[PDB]
Structure formats: structure tokens, C-alpha cells
Amino acid sequence: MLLPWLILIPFIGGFLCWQTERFGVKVPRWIALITMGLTLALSLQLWLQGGYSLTQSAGIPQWQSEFDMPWIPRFGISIHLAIDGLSLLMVVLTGLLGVLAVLCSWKEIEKYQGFFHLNLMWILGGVIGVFLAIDMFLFFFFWEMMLVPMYFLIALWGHKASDGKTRITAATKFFIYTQASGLVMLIAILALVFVHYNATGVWTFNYEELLNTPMSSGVEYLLMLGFFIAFAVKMPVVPLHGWLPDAHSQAPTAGSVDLAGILLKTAAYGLLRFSLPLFPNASAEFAPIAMWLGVIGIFYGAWMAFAQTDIKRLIAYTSVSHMGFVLIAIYTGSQLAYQGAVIQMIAHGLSAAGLFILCGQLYERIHTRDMRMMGGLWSKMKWLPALSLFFAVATLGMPGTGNFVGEFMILFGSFQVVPVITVISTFGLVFASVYSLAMLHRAYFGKAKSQIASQELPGMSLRELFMILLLVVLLVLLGFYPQPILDTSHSAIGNIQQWFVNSV
């Protein structure tokens, strides 16, 4: 019921901001803040009003709210929006990140600003629609239309048409690397539906009847690779992640909040929801390749993070290290491991968003991007580097932050299922420390005479500090007290694991 409205407010707000662009220029900032407030209101209403602590073994079909509507009846394509417990965590996270995106874009007036915000709400609404998606075509359409408006963001707002490096390399690799694999998973969807159409005799694009379709061995394996390729180019996996640092280092850091904190979520959401249950034996065969790619991703991202000299590419290469833990979590037979991935995933978004906001904040203070050029700014800034120290501290497994409990319950479940690949995996924490300290010492520890421009520094406004203070206190409560959201996700995680166990 609430789901059609909850995916449509982003699109309605873009229309109204661009409508009132003719009326005024200070309107869309204040319009956008209220519209994202309504998005979190409906999302938090579903958290509180709904039975978040529901039955742990109520089957694979279980939803607090559900919407159905005929869209293309010839294939049974329907607007099958349906919200689960873990999907509701995803919706509340993106509503909060949308508030941060529209708050960081405050006091940013240009030649056109309504165009920026209709695009801003369009891309955030696309991610919400992926998170509420049970029909395969609706899932794919939303997956691919959140991908078009970021291209305009990197192009027309990466820099205003002055340098050609903001389109022809950064934005173009971002677009092609995702869309080729999106078309791969579309033909994977179609091969799965056609083998189901031979089995039964109905053209259906719905998840519940495609869940248990009979397929011979050696056939569903190729479709599982087809799903995983599109789910491995969106979250950074080892062979195909070259788009991520270019995308984050060129887009404005509000666009980078969208590009890191929430676009990385949807691929592991799809690995939990759409790839694991549909292909149980194929995923059981593919598991060790996934573990090898996971350990390679953690070690690889940390080394490339240590070796880099700038900051946006630095945090962009932390992200690829973080997601390796999540991939190993998903491809195991443990309930605790999956519940560790969820808390690690929410904390991943919350620990990347603050760093990107602050890195963009530091650049507009000093007008210099290279990290090794500055140094010793602690005597000049009064609140930026202290808050930045805790966010760099929250990146690695420091307890009292959500990242520690996240990565570390994965390791418990991972050692429960398989010893040797887990005992390799744990060493990324040592490597997490070295790139964390490298960031901290090269940027803030030292003498302010490392740069001439490090001798005249501005002040920090109240609202940026307010939205940084909220994230640090929110992330500490998730580290100390993670029970409420684990009780929320228990049943959804449990039935996925029980199906992955029982179907093999």
C-alpha cells in the first residue's frame, strides 16, 4: 500500500523542484529537504508499525506490505513491490543518505539548480525501487534507470564543461561497465523464464514461481554466472571494479555519497535476495570461486589503498576491500554470517558517507586535492580533523563502531563453515590499519609548512557539523547496541539460509 507512494516521492519532488524553478531559485533546496523527510517518515513508519520481529520460519514468501499491479500483461510483468525486513533497513538507510545529499548541496546555487535536484531525487528514487523489487523486470528496469542520471551528474556537474576528463574517461567507464553486465543479467532472466515456460506453460516474470522452477544440472550454472556478473560490476569485485575510483574522484561529493554509500548496497542485496535462492546448486558449486575472489578483493583493495596519493581515490579503494567480507559472507552456509554482513553493510554506508562529506569539505577549505601536498593542519582546523580521526578509526575494526561487529561475525560464521579461507581473510584488519594510518598521518599529522596554502584557513559552519555529529553518534550506537536491527532482519536472513540449506 505505502510502497507505490514510497518509490514515487523522489520522482514527484523532481517534477516540483523543476516546476518551482521558474518561481524561485532558493526553493528547491527547501523543497528537497522536506520531501526526503517524508520519505524517511514512511520508511520509519514501516519500521515501527510493522511487525519487524516476525516469525523466523514463515517460508520464503513473507512481506510486511505488498503491492501488485498489471504493467505489461503479455509476459505477466507487474509492479510487484514488496517490502521485507532487511529491505526496510535498506530503505531507511537511503532516506538518511538522501537527507545528507540534499544537506551537502545546501547553499549551492548555480545557473541551473532545479535540474541538479530533479536528477538528485531521480537517482535516489531509483535505488529505493531496486530495494523494493520482486518482479524481475521491474527489478531490472529500476536497476538500469538509476544508472542513467548519474552520468549527467558526472558530466555536467563533474566540472562545468571546462575539462574533458570528467566525461570521456570517468563517466563513460561508469556507464559502459554497468550496462553491458546489466544486459547480461537480462538475458539471464530470459533464459530462466524460458526454461520455466517449457516446464509449466505460463509467461511469468514473478519471483515466487520462478523460485522453484525445475532446471537440469549444467544449465542453471550459466544463468548463475549471468546474474553474478551484473552483481559483481556494481559492488566492487576483483575482475571488474575499475569504474569506482574514477567515479568517486570526479563526481561532486554529494554524488559520491550516492555512488558509494548506497549504490554498493544493491548488488549484495541482489546476491542475498535474487541470486542465492533461485540457484541453490549452482551457487553451491560456485562457492569456492566466490571465496577466492573475496579474499583477493580484501588484500587487493588495501594494497591499492596504501599505494595511492590522493584522498577520493583513497576512500574509493577502501570500499573494494570492505565488500570482500560481504561476498564471503553471502556465499557461506551460516545464519550468523549473513546477519554480520547486514550490520557491516549498513556501517559501510555510514562510514563512507562521513569521510566523503569531510574530504569534499576539506578540499573546499584549502582548494587542494593532493594528500601529500598538505600536512599538519591540526593546529588550523578546529573540528574537521578530530571528527575525521574517528571516521578513519571507524573504517577499520574498532569496537564501538558498527564495522567491528559487522566484519567480525562474518568471520565467526566463516570459520564455522570453512577454516582455511577464513584464516587468510582475517589479515585484512592489519592492512586496514596501515591504510587508515597512512591517510591520517599524511593529511593531518605534521607541520603546516608542507604547503604554502596551509597558512590561511576558513571556519566551519553549523549545519555541516550538525550532520557530521549525527553520523558519528549514530554509528557509535550501531557499534555498541546492534540488537534492534538484527532482530529485524532475523527472519528474512533465516529463510534464505534455510532454503539454501534445504534445497541442496
Binding site: 575482475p239 599505494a307 574498532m398 590499519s433 540488537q483
Partner: protein, 612 residues
């Protein structure tokens, strides 16, 4: 009595105030609030200590809230205040109180003031969490809590980068130990399910009817965690470099706070180490080989702070032996004495290096008895206890008891190790004060007089002596494995240690009382410098631990200065663009070849149809 969290909240909350009053407060109010947090901690500790005496040595547990709870994974914020943990709390909330009260006077006059009293409170708070934890998890929060605080205090002076660079080697090395520590934590949950210490104690033999082979992996790798955090051979790197910070943080790190975490883990899991005897004796094996290493490196270099540091390494491993010889209460008795002398010994040295005014040498000063005898009596009291002198010393009872226990274990190599350690402690006892305080004063050490440090000096003077040895720590509340006692040979071993100490003290005094030309000759002899260079490398261990992984790590980082796999999956774009350029060059514009293309399409279509 429902006041355990006040030993954690009151310090920790004070840190938050000093973490946001970044120098905007004045000197006096910042000084009072920084000392008062630890002062309230000691007072609440004393109340629960005297109530623990009123409890009849009955343990008191308090769960605040469950941390995380999955249906097979139950972790809670459980605090246990038993006899072993009360003693380890007593050391911290007294020593940190005394060390931090000195810092109220030592820190003033320079910047970074509110910053330093912020991170000291966090350092103390992390150490209290480790020794009161009831679950191995919460205790893990203690381990890397105090490690990050050692990073924030070793590299406290961020201006020059020597001490600013010395902290990360400790940080890397302590997290290697923490990986080793968490490995055993995974194995214990896989094997025995619950991580509570007592429930683990009477769950371990129930689950172990059939298979035992994998418990040695748990316990050996648990041991690898304990050793690394304080000091031991496989990971002895950072304690020389930890001296690059200020004097009060060296006392806190090296005396009784952070280095007393590896002792608490072996002692708390003593029944768990009793489940396997050979992993218990292996602690003493590694302890016996580190007393042979950690001693004479104090004699080698001319840095006073490196002197006090190699002595701490020797003493901590001396404990590991004491725990390996199944003498548990005696080892904590050694700790109860050891905290008192080391902290004062470190602190007094700081007062005189304030008076030295940038000397940092042991060979260019002399005749310091006439400058101020207060620091003279400070080193003197510390030296006597360390050397195992029988004259009104505090720690000699602890050495006598553990060697009685060690010979009750019956390991002649361990008494040989104990005998050479007593001789070696007496060697570097008075050699430092004889080479520094005796001679001629060509550079005057300007002594500073003030009641603000004299009163804690008198308190530390009256505490480090044998008056403090009369305070028996609470050891009857845990009922550990009983430290066995020997009679008849107790007087024989006591006089043997006294003779060994006296011979070492007389040899140092004979080194002093000679011309020192033979000392100069052995400090100039080529085999002497070879051994000095060999033990500059300290059995090559820092040499080996740098050149085994560091330059391979820098080499693979230099090979990863440009990202390989991003480039090697760009070759589809490279092949497509170059193949597209070739296809564009294939077009001509001359219309004869267009019609030839039409004929050559007809030829291939007919050929492709005739092969079907």
C-alpha cells in the same frame, strides 16, 4: 557493590570533556578534572575493595546490557570482580593515579595539554575494561582499546616525526598479536560454545571426552596473543621505540598498565591452560629464553630510557616463567611489588632529565649526589628491589617464593635461568647510577624543588619499599591452583639469591671503582663491538622482522603504484577502438571498390549457401 561501571564511566566521561575542550580551558581547571577522574576511580576501587573484604572474598558480578545476541551467539557486558581481577584493578587505579598525579606537574608549561589528559583517561579506561571483563569478547575490546591509546600517546608529540613515526611499529605489532588472539577466540566458540570464563572452566572437560588434538592449536595460538601485547621473543620489537614519547606515558605503558595485559590473560585462563600441560610449560620455555636476551641490552646503549625498557622486558618474561611453573599467586605478588618500583624508577628519571636540560647521555655526567639527593634515593630504592637484595626490599619475597616454586617444579634449567637472571639484574642495577651520578659534573643538572611532585615522591618512596610488601593482595577469592610451598630450603635459596645479588652489586661497584680503562677496552674491543652490533640487532630479530616482510611489502606496493587489473580489463576497449580504427581505414570513398564490395558479398553469400 553496584559501583563497577563507575571505575569505567567516570574516567571515560572525563575524556569526552577533554576531547572537545581542545585547549580552550585554562591550565588549572583542566589539571583538576584530569586528575579527579582517576581519583574518583581509585576511591570507588577502594570502596569495593574494602567491601570485597566485607564480602568474605566472594565474587560480585554485574551485567549491564547484552552486547549482541544471536540464538547461538550470546555476548553480554558482564563484569566479574574476583580476587585476581581486584588485584589487577588495584595496580591500575593506584599506579595510574600516581603516574597521572605527577603528570599534573610534568605537563605544564607546554601545549597539547587538554589533549594529553584526554588520551590518558582513555588509556586508563581501556585497561580497566580488559581486567574486569567476563567474556573474551569484551576483553578483546580491552586489548585493542589500549593499543590505540598507546598509539595516541607514543606518537604524542606530532611535530617531530621520529616519535611520530615510532608509534606505528608498535601499532602494527600489537595488531599482529591481536589477530593471533582472535584466532583462539574463533576456535573456542567452535569447540566449546560459550566464552564466559567460569562456564568455560566447567564446560571444557565435559566437551573433551573424545578429541583433544585441536585444543593445542587453540591454546598455543591463544598464547601467541598474550605474549605479543606485552613483550616476548617472537614479537619483541617496539619497546625500545616506545621510549621516544614523554616520560609519563613511558611509565604508563611500560610499568604496570598496558604491559600487564598479557599477564592477566594467562592468569585468568589458568584452568584453561591446565587443560593442557605442555602449552603451560611452553610459556616458561619462552620465558627462560627471553631473560637471556632482555638483560644486557640495558648496558649497551647510552639512553637511560632504553635502560629502563630492557629491564621491563626482562621482568615481564620473568613473570611468564612464574606462570609457567604453576605459581600463580606468587606471580601476581611479583606484579604487586613490580608496579611500585618500576613506576617510580621511570618517573624519577624524568625529573632528573628535566634537570639535565637536553643531555640524553650516561657518560658525560657525574657527581650528581651533590646536585639533589632526592632522585639519588629514588634510583637507590628501585635498584635494591630489582637486584633481589635482602635489605628491607619489597620484591625479594616474590623472587624467593617463585624460585621455591620453580624448584618444587624441579627443572634445573629453570633454576639456572633464575640464577643467571638474579646475577644479570644485579649487573644493571647500579652500573647506571655509578656511570651517571658519579664522576664530575661538567654540565650542571639544575634541580627543581616543589611540593607538587615531592608529596607523590614520598608516597612512592613509602610504597615501593617493604612497607608496601606487607599489603597482601586478595588472592583467596578465586581459589586458583595452589602455589606449592617448600620449607627448609627456603632459607638456603634466600641466602643464595642474596649472595648472587651481592656479587653482582660488588662487580658493578668494582667496575665503577676501577680506572674504567678496561671498560673502555672492552667497549673498544672488536669482538666486543661485534657482540654489541649483534645485540644492537637483538639476535637480529628487528633485522629479521623488517627484512622478512617489509621490503617485500614496499616492493609489492611499488609494483601496485599503478593498478594492474583495471588496465588488463581495459583491453576490450583497446581492441575495440583499434579494430574500429582499422574498419574506418578500410573505407575508401572510390566508388569502384564499393561495387567490388557488392560483388564480393555476392561471391561469399553464394559460397556460404553452397556449403549448406
Amino acid at each position: 557493590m553496584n559501583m563497577l561501571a563507575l571505575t569505567i564511566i567516570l574516567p571515560l566521561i572525563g575524556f569526552v570533556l577533554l576531547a572537545f575542550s581542545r585547549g580552550r580551558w585554562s591550565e588549572n581547571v583542566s589539571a583538576i578534572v584530569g586528575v579527579g577522574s582517576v581519583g574518583l576511580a581509585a576511591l570507588v576501587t577502594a570502596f569495593i575493595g574494602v567491601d570485597f573484604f566485607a564480602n568474605g572474598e566472594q565474587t560480585y558480578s554485574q551485567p549491564l546490557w547484552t552486547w549482541m545476541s544471536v540464538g547461538d551467539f550470546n555476548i553480554g557486558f558482564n563484569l566479574v570482580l574476583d580476587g585476581l581481577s581486584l588485584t589487577m584493578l588495584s595496580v591500575v587505579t593506584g599506579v595510574g593515579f600516581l603516574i597521572h598525579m605527577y603528570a599534573s606537574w610534568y605537563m605544564r608549561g607546554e601545549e597539547g595539554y587538554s589533549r594529553f589528559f584526554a588520551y590518558t583517561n582513555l588509556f586508563i579506561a581501556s585497561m580497566v575494561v580488559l581486567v574486569l571483563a567476563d567474556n573474551l569478547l569484551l576483553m578483546y575490546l580491552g586489548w585493542e582499546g589500549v593499543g590505540l591509546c598507546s598509539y595516541l600517546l607514543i606518537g604524542f608529540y606530532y611535530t617531530d616525526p621520529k616519535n611520530g613515526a615510532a608509534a606505528m611499529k608498535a601499532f602494527v605489532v600489537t595488531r599482529v598479536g591481536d589477530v593471533f588472539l582472535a584466532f583462539a577466540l574463533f576456535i573456542l566458540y567452535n569447540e566449546l560454545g560459550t566464552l564466559n570464563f567460569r562456564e568455560m572452566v566447567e564446560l571444557a572437560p565435559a566437551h573433551f571426552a573424545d578429541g583433544n588434538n585441536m585444543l593445542m592449536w587453540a591454546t598455543l595460538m591463544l598464547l601467541g596473543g598474550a605474549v605479543g601485547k606485552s613483550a616476548q621473543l617472537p614479537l619483541q620489537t617496539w619497546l625500545a621505540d616506545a621510549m621516544a614519547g614523554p616520560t609519563p606515558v613511558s611509565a604508563l605503558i611500560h610499568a604496570a598498565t598496558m604491559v600487564t595485559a598479557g599477564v592477566y590473560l594467562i592468569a585468568r585462563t589458568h584452568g584453561l591452560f591446565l587443560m593442557t600441560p605442555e602449552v603451560l610449560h611452553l610459556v616458561g620455555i619462552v620465558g627462560a629464553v627471553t631473560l637471556l636476551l632482555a638483560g644486557f641490552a640495558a648496558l649497551v646503549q647510552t639512553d637511560i630510557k632504553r635502560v629502563l625498557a630492557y629491564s621491563t622486558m626482562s621482568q615481564i618474561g620473568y613473570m611468564f616463567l612464574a606462570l609457567g611453573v604453576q605459581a600463580w599467586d606468587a606471580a601476581i605478588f611479583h606484579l604487586m611489588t613490580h608496579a611500585f618500583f618500576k613506576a617510580l624508577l621511570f618517573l624519577a628519571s624524568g625529573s632528573v632529565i628535566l634537570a639535565c636540560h637536553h643531555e640524553q647521555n650516561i657518560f658525560k655526567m657525574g657527581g650528581l649526589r651533590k646536585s639533589i639527593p632526592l632522585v639519588y634515593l629514588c634510583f637507590l630504592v628501585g635498584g635494591a628491589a630489582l637486584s633481589a637484595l635482602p635489605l628491607v626490599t619489597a620484591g625479594f619475597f616474590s623472587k624467593d617464593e617463585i624460585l621455591a616454586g620453580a624448584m618444587a617444579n624441579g627443572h634445573i634449567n629453570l633454576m639456572v635461568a633464575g640464577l643467571v637472571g638474579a646475577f644479570m639484574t644485579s649487573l644493571y642495577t647500579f652500573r647506571m647510577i655509578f656511570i651517571v651520578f658519579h664522576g664530575k659534573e661538567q654540565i650542571h643538572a639544575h634541580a627543581v624543588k616543589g611540593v607538587t611532585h615531592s608529596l607523590p615522591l614520598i608516597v612512592l618512596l613509602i610504597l615501593s619499599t617493604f612497607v608496601g610488601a606487607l599489603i597482601v593482595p586478595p588472592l583467596q577469592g578465586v581459589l586458583p591452583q595452589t602455589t606449592e610451598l617448600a620449607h627448609g630450603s627456603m632459607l638456603t635459596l634466600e641466602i643464595t639469591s642474596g649472595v648472587v645479588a651481592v656479587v653482582g652489586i660488588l662487580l658493578a661497584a668494582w667496575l665503577w671503582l676501577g680506572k674504567r680503562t678496561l671498560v673502555t677496552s672492552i667497549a673498544n674491543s672488536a669482538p666486543g663491538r661485534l657482540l654489541s652490533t649483534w645485540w644492537y640487532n637483538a639476535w637480529g630479530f628487528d633485522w629479521l622482522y623488517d627484512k622478512v616482510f617489509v621490503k617485500p611489502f614496499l616492493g609489492i606496493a611499488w609494483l601496485l603504484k599503478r593498478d594492474p587489473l583495471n588496465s588488463m580489463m581495459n583491453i576490450p576497449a583497446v581492441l575495440s577502438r583499434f579494430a574500429g580504427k582499422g574498419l574506418l581505414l578500410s573505407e575508401n570513398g572510390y566508388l569502384r571498390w564499393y561495387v567490388a564490395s557488392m560483388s564480393i558479398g555476392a561471391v561469399v553469400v553464394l559460397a556460404l549457401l553452397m556449403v549448406l
